[PDB]
């Protein structure tokens, strides 16, 4: 049997919502790219095309060719009566030629005159109606149940939506259980990235999707009562008893410490998971991490060579009639403070096809769709040394070098209709390029949730969260653990390293006298918060740390060291905790928050600055 | 008479990577090539097609013809009802004109208009399906049983698939027998090349195909028990006693020394074999070979010309309406130190057809699918600078001549029809490339060069200073692994491992200045809990993560992305294979590449990985783990430099 889902993949090169793409005689490409899950399989695939061609092109000498993967499944020609009015064409596609990665393109041939034709004309064009797309039916299958393909059944690096694998415990998780769950969630988030993270928690119940069960040989769920007690911590991939189509990663441990050991092994020793029933017996670190050494963040110890910010070899090269924009993405630590403008000389040693004549072709530099500079291409490689100001300071910004060439030799001579094949040009960016981030000081206002909501700066200073103390209340419920896991996964995803050395506590009595970023995930704000009462909540949080439910993300300095920051998210009701989880997950509203106290209502986010601003760093 | 295998080879298997080629008016050519063994004759040989024509072309005037070496002009015309639909056509092929190498060419002709058309139109086309290939059943023929054709009866150089030559032993192999088998496997792999080398090993069993037999007059394979005792190492060629259609090879001798001498003679003195029962009595060397001297690697003593990097007579020349891309395949040694130099300087002498006008037709140079330089064909020994940045170990250069020929289409009143003229182009055999001004010094704590070319062990082509450690009384798996690895090393080069020495105990490396390679169990002198990041004692395999994972690092190593951070030890019932490359703690200048498994499944996975080049190229760093889910590599451990300067 197996459940099935529907997908309606639209056009990747579609114009903005207000606009609509048009296939002309110079860009007849409707490429649509989509990948497979390695677990689903396409059982039904249709292609809908709601399009209108020009009334001035020949019917039989003009057709659309659909290529699934260089196969040319079907061809659709237009007739005399099917030229002016819009047309809805349905085309089935057999999934026999579907690989892991698929690129379905639509080639449009144009012919409006016989004796003489000129490309780039405005009389021939075909405009889609934005209702054209691939309707696919994804059906799951039963994998061979092997931990060698880990974490393929739970998270595979091919999806684009948010994975929602639940993490189910037995009830009332203790310190070690919370720590192991946080470590596992941080690893899953660091491995997911921008795809989206969500880690719901269940209490002695079985979910539907692939789940992760936590047990400690005592006070275990009911469905794990069949497994015998084992001293060494085992990590198995069992099948759900009702329906084996879904998998449960059961992490067994003799005691509280065995669970932490298993979590650390999953976070570090993941490349050597073999077969099933993998037992990890010994894992320990040797060398500690350094501050501001996150893998995802660019390093400030040496200038980057433009080779590490690729993720694949063919990113810095484009070949075709019209070369596409070359975009390289990067995320920097929120420490390059302004008011000095030292300069970031982004050296670019580029090489391209030289145009035959001086046609004033352009090469433009952009930073998140923002025209910065333009240069000419004429001659010999080009050496560009330019300082790019207005950095994003924390968020993933993409330098986009776009080479726009105006086609030379448009017609040559009009007396004779010369027909010629346009020459495709190739443009690449030298991998020897260099950007400078070596000499820069770490000076930035601490009490600002912009850096925290953008990259989690207060806690992600250390890659492994060594100096991070998470405070949790007594006997956490389902919502508190859910928000803890969500925030931990968010912090781990904003960085590129799992929180293997994270320490979590259950009480606020053992926090007095330690140098570490405090995070009071436990909420329960005293019922004194209202539209008017905004500072009273800050005073209550201060008194606590000294020892429509509002979900306040309160940021203030640690009163014990005067060097760390305390970001204490507080909520009371399940509705408030759900709102907080949605805000932490939703990047849209998470990026539009700032100030000291960020309260989220049923409709609105009232970021309000309050308190005294203090700086961190040395010189 | 005999076992007639049935081969269903589709189009994508032997057609270009695209597979489904599209025939147009500009490119009416496009063929599918295959070969024969010379030990088989082609039977029925049926061909099936699946093609889709254009709805604009005329039915009776447009058609697809097939050419079997300019013969069997099987024509298929476009019928009215199949003008735009996908139709499957069955084309019978006669095996009378089939030869050792066949090329079936499909030529499509079409006319979308009748009164007057325009060449180079995009409205007429005919696309052949991807799941449409030949169907030909071979039939084996008895060989004349003559060694003069050696080694085509066992492995013919006109084949295209992986040759599997079993090496049947007599049981309980000794050092000399293992050495002789490794030498023979290295020679067979060097003579095979890129086709793929797989050498199954079976003790006292009888194979079903051509195999090689080893005997020392005392340990016999139990099927040659009735045979007169030999007094000198002979090389007899007989047939299987239960199937006279498959030929075997009986290497015979009195002592392991005689067997080694026979293997040497087979490796070098194989060009004067006559009849059968060739008696090799003396094979002595006259002068040794210097390092970095391999028939497949690029010469460094002098600038090499394109006449030595050909591997094919008509490679540097192309012809046609749109000339094909000339691509040479040069393989340089990894030890070449290239970072310090700004780039390599080469000379090119490209002769082309002068275009009618200055239409800006351009010759582009690509190195590993990376645009390098463009030269206009209208600018009338040119120097080219290659930035030595991405030059690996199996790179190639591709010269593509993008032509934009102006076709006169006439005025609006006249519709002139001309003959499409084809052009030719030659890159020049006088073009030379400089590879002599570079030293041999690279940071080699990794094993990428081991999978690509076998640098640490293939420094000397004959492997004089390479000692391979093997366990006591190896089984089928370990022997097959050793043979497959030695054959792969020999195939990366072009010379067999003549002076290879195999060791059985670990009490011999102490004091010897040679390269060590472990295949089975690692001795106690190794496994010093340092500079080794994966051990497999059938349980508790432990790995160290190098504090960071970078997708594509630079040519320069770092001390922060390779230092060990943790030590994760896991044990399970599954199987794995570990290939660890570390520094030898004996002379501190050589390396040790130990590949070991734990269970028969692990050994099978390791053999399958080291056999195929696809899953082997995706192996870099200092540690590799081969599991059912492919192979994962990481760069962890200390770094050391080899060579001088």
UniProtKB/Swiss-Prot annotation, chain A:
<comment type="function">
    <text>Binds the cellulose synthase activator, bis-(3'-5') cyclic diguanylic acid (c-di-GMP).</text>
</comment>
<dbReference type="InterPro" id="IPR018513">
    <property type="entry name" value="Cell_synthase_bac"/>
</dbReference>
<keyword id="KW-1133">Transmembrane helix</keyword>
<feature type="topological domain" description="Periplasmic">
    <location>
        <begin position="1"/>
        <end position="619"/>
    </location>
</feature>
<keyword id="KW-0973">c-di-GMP</keyword>
<dbReference type="GO" id="GO:0006011">
    <property type="term" value="P:UDP-alpha-D-glucose metabolic process"/>
</dbReference>
<dbReference type="Pfam" id="PF03170">
    <property type="entry name" value="BcsB"/>
</dbReference>
<dbReference type="GO" id="GO:0005886">
    <property type="term" value="C:plasma membrane"/>
</dbReference>
<dbReference type="GO" id="GO:0030244">
    <property type="term" value="P:cellulose biosynthetic process"/>
</dbReference>
<keyword id="KW-0472">Membrane</keyword>
<keyword id="KW-0732">Signal</keyword>
<comment type="pathway">
    <text>Glycan metabolism; bacterial cellulose biosynthesis.</text>
</comment>
<protein>
    <recommendedName>
        <fullName>Cyclic di-GMP-binding protein</fullName>
    </recommendedName>
</protein>
<keyword id="KW-0997">Cell inner membrane</keyword>
<comment type="subunit">
    <text>Tightly associated with the cellulose synthase catalytic subunit.</text>
</comment>
<dbReference type="InterPro" id="IPR003920">
    <property type="entry name" value="Cell_synth_B"/>
</dbReference>
<keyword id="KW-1003">Cell membrane</keyword>
<keyword id="KW-0135">Cellulose biosynthesis</keyword>
<keyword id="KW-0812">Transmembrane</keyword>
<comment type="similarity">
    <text>Belongs to the AcsB/BcsB family.</text>
</comment>
């Amino acid at each position: 049997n197996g459940p099935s889902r529907d997908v309606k993949l639209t056009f990747a090169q579609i114009a903005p919502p207000p606009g609509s793409m048009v296939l002309r005689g110079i860009n007849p490409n409707g490429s649509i790219e989509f990948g497979m899950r390695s677990d689903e399989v396409v059982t039904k695939a249709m292609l809908n095309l709601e399009y209108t061609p020009s009334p001035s092109l020949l019917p039989v000498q003009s057709q659309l060719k659909v290529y699934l993967n260089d196969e040319l499944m079907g061809v659709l020609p237009v007739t005399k009566e099917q030229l002016g009015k819009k047309t809805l064409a349905q085309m089935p596609i057999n999934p026999l030629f579907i690989s892991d990665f698929n690129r379905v393109r639509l080639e449009f041939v144009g012919h409006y005159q016989d004796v003489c034709e000129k490309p780039a004309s405005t009389t021939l064009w075909l405009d889609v109606g934005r209702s054209s797309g691939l309707d696919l039916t994804y059906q799951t299958l039963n994998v061979k149940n092997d931990l060698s393909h880990f974490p393929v059944p739970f998270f595979d690096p091919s999806d684009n939506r948010t994975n929602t694998l639940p993490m189910v415990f037995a009830g009332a998780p203790d310190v070690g259980l919370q720590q192991a769950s946080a470590i596992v969630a941080s690893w899953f988030g660091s491995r997911s990235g921008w795809r989206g993270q969500n880690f719901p928690v269940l209490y002695n119940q079985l979910p539907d999707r692939n789940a992760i069960v936590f047990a400690t040989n005592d006070k275990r769920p009911d469905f794990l009562r069949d497994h015998p007690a084992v001293k060494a911590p085992v990590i198995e991939m069992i099948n759900h008893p009702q329906n084996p189509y879904v998998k449960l990663l059961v992490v067994f441990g003799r005691d509280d410490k065995d669970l932490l050991q298993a979590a650390k092994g999953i976070a570090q020793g993941n490349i050597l998971f073999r077969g099933e029933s993998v037992v990890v017996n010994e894992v320990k670190p040797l060398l500690p991490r350094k501050p501001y050494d996150a893998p995802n963040w660019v390093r400030t110890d040496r200038p980057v060579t433009f080779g590490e910010l690729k993720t694949y070899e063919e990113q810095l090269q484009s070949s075709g009639l019209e070369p596409a924009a070359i975009n390289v993405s990067l995320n920097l630590p929120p420490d390059l403070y302004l008011m000095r403008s030292t300069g970031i000389d982004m050296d670019i040693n580029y090489r391209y096809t030289m145009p035959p004549v001086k046609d004033s072709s352009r090469m433009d530099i952009s930073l998140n769709n923002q025209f910065l500079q333009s240069f000419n291409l004429s001659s010999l490689d080009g050496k560009t040394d330019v300082s790019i100001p207005a950095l994003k300071l924390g968020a993933t910004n993409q330098l986009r070098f776009d080479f726009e060439y105006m086609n030379p030799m448009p017609g040559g001579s009009v007396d004779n209709c010369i027909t010629f094949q346009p020459v495709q040009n190739h443009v690449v960016i030298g991998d020897d390029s260099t950007i400078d981030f070596s000499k820069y000081y770490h000076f930035i206002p601490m009490p600002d949730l912009r850096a925290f909501a953008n990259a989690g700066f207060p806690f992600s200073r250390m890659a492994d969260l060594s100096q991070t103390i998470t405070v949790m209340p007594k006997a956490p419920n389902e919502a508190q653990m859910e928000t803890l896991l969500n925030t931990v996964g968010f912090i781990g995803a904003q960085t590129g390293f799992p929180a293997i050395n994270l320490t979590v506590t259950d009480d606020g009595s053992t926090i007095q006298g330690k140098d570490a970023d405090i995070m009071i995930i436990g909420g329960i704000p005293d019922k004194l918060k209202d539209d008017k009462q905004i500072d009273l909540l800050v005073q209550a949080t201060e008194s606590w740390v000294k020892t429509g439910a509002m979900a306040a993300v309160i940021g203030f300095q640690s009163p014990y060291n005067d060097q760390r920051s305390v970001i204490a998210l507080l909520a009371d009701s399940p509705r408030g905790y759900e709102m907080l989880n949605d805000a932490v997950n939703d990047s849209g509203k998470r990026a539009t928050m700032f100030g000291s106290v960020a309260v989220i209502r049923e409709s609105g986010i009232n970021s309000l600055r309050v308190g005294d601003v203090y700086y961190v760093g040395h010189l």
